[PDB]
């Protein structure tokens, strides 16, 4: 149950957020963006993916 | 009447407080409940069973 709670919380979208709407080159700088507190985790974004 | 008592203390009447994680000093997202539960040690303590 707690694992799924965490993954639900991680993957929601909140229509207002810090850092919302920018475009990123990958998960790693997604993480740098999260961890430094520059973007909120459920903020909307576009990323390059593979 | 609980709110009224918490207001008589200088405490936050939401009952919740923002907390930080002592592993980093980061803030938790949204406040969390904090307060004085009563807890009992039960007589099923482990070295009596290992």
């Amino acid at each position: 149950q707690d694992v799924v709670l965490g993954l639900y919380y991680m993957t929601r979208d909140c229509v207002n957020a810090k850092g919302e709407g920018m475009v990123l080159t990958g998960p790693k700088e997604a993480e740098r963006l999260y961890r430094s507190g520059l973007a909120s985790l459920h903020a909307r974004v576009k990323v390059r993916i593979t | 009447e609980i709110k009224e008592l918490l207001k008589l203390g200088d405490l936050p009447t939401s009952g919740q407080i923002r907390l930080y994680d002592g592993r980093t000093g980061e803030q938790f997202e949204r406040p969390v409940t904090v307060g004085y539960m009563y807890m009992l040690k039960l007589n099923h303590l482990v070295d009596d069973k290992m």
């Binding site: 694992v3 | 482990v46 070295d47 290992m50």
Partner: protein, 51 residues
């Protein structure tokens, strides 16, 4: 005497000897399973959360 060597020996004995944990009752085959042990200071058996 629990001498200072014995743990470095123990951590060689156990180093990959599976031990079988089962609760009771044990309704179905998944109720006995084997795990590789890792040593602990306390007295509880530390089980894996998903299992």
């Amino acid at each position: 005497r629990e001498e200072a060597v014995v743990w470095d020996i123990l951590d060689e004995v156990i180093r990959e000897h599976p031990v079988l944990l089962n609760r009771a009752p044990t309704l179905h085959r998944l109720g006995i399973q084997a795990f590789e042990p890792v040593l602990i200071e306390g007295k509880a058996i530390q089980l894996h959360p998903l299992v």
